[PDB]
Amino acid sequence: TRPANHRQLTFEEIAKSAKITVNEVELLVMKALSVGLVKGSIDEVDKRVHMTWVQPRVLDLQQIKGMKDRLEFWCTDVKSMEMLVEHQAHDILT
C-alpha cells in the first residue's frame, strides 16, 4: 500500500494494525525476513524499518489502469530526453 515515496513504517503502526505488543513485532519481522517474503532493514532506536522489496501479489483489471498511467508519462520522459539527443547531437553524425 505504501508508495515509493516512503514505504517506511513504524512499530507503533504495527502495534496498531496487528494489535500485537511492542516486544513481539521484532521477532515477527525478523521471521518475515528469515522466510524472505519481504526484504528490508531494521532500525531499533527510531522504531522504524526500511522495507524495500515485497512479495509480489495479484491484481484485477483496475490496477492495470494505474500501471498504464505510470507507463504513460514514462514514455514521454524517454521522448523528451531523447529529443535533446536527436536535436543537439544532429551535426555530429547525419
**Dist. CA 34–CA 84, nearest whole Å:** 47
Give the residue among 54, 35, 51 at the shortest CA–CA distance from 43. Answer: 51
Query: Site residues (CB under 8 A) for another protein?
Result: 4, 53-54, 56-59, 61, 64-65, 67-68, 70-71, 74-75, 77-78, 81-82, 85-86, 89, 92-93
**Residue 85 beta carbon to another protein: minimum distance, rounded to whole angstroms:** 6
**Residue 23 beta carbon to another protein: minimum distance, rounded to whole angstroms:** 31
**Residue 40 beta carbon to another protein: minimum distance, rounded to whole angstroms:** 12
**Dist. CA 11–CA 28, nearest whole Å:** 11
31/39 with CB nearer another protein: 39
**Dist. CA 31–CA 48, nearest whole Å:** 16
